[PDB]
Amino acid sequence: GLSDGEWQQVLNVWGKVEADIAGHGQEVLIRLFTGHPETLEKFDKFKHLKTEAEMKASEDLKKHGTVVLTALGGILKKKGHHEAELKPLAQSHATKHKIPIKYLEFISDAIIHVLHSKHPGDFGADAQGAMTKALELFRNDIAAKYKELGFQ
Ligand code: HEM
């Protein structure tokens, strides 16, 4: 649950992402894959990437970063009223991709890391607080659907 002022901060931060969605999406995925190499094994289409240079050179990885961040942005713009948008993603991630909730924690922290890396000094303490709460709400509503499905 976020206040109106917190949502305003989230959507202000998101404007930084929307100016270069593919560059942000690329770096989020590279941070996830290099920090947590077990996450790469869930992607049949990326497991061939052995080095970060190959990851950086991969246009398909940048494409997938765009898909991921476009979906997240659509959810964030609902300011918590995201049941219809979140349900299919929860269902596909539990039943088809088999993504443990832990990996959604990893990607949440990776988003915070990338924002500080690309906008140093321009991602303030209030903005980090609001973004973190928004990613927690997203993860918590996914977790509720995971529990319904019995997925661990
Ligand atoms: C911010 C969180 C994330 C969002 C919004 C997101 C969004 C999406 C979307 C929109 C798709 C394509 C449609 C679908 O299959 O449902 C996708 C595919 C996928 N997601 Fe996620 N995702 C997230 C986090 C993750 C994480 C943490 C992992 C794994 C570590 C992951 C693994 C996958 C995989 C394996 C695919 C299929 C890729 C394919 O082979 O083309 N997702 N995701």
UniProtKB/Swiss-Prot annotation:
The keyword Metal-binding applies. Nitrite binds at H64. It is an enzyme of class 1 (oxidoreductase). It catalyses: Fe(III)-heme b-[protein] + nitric oxide + H2O = Fe(II)-heme b-[protein] + nitrite + 2 H(+); H2O2 + AH2 = A + 2 H2O. One of its GO terms (biological process) is removal of superoxide radicals. Its main location: cytoplasm. Heme b binds at H93. Residues 1-147 form the Globin domain. Keywords: Cytoplasm, Heme, Iron, Metal-binding, Muscle protein, Oxidoreductase, Oxygen transport, Phosphoprotein, Transport. The modification Phosphoserine is found at S3. Its EC number is 1.7.-.-, 1.11.1.-. InterPro entries: Globin, Globin-like_sf, Myoglobin. O2 binds at H64. It is found in: Cytoplasm, Sarcoplasm. The keyword Nucleus does not apply. GO terms for molecular function: heme binding; metal ion binding; nitrite reductase activity; oxygen binding; oxygen carrier activity; peroxidase activity. Monomeric heme protein which primary function is to store oxygen and facilitate its diffusion within muscle tissues. Reversibly binds oxygen through a pentacoordinated heme iron and enables its timely and efficient release as needed during periods of heightened demand. Depending on the oxidative conditions of tissues and cells, and in addition to its ability to bind oxygen, it also has a nitrite reductase activity whereby it regulates the production of bioactive nitric oxide. Belongs to the globin family. PANTHER family: MYOGLOBIN (PTHR47132:SF1). This is Myoglobin.
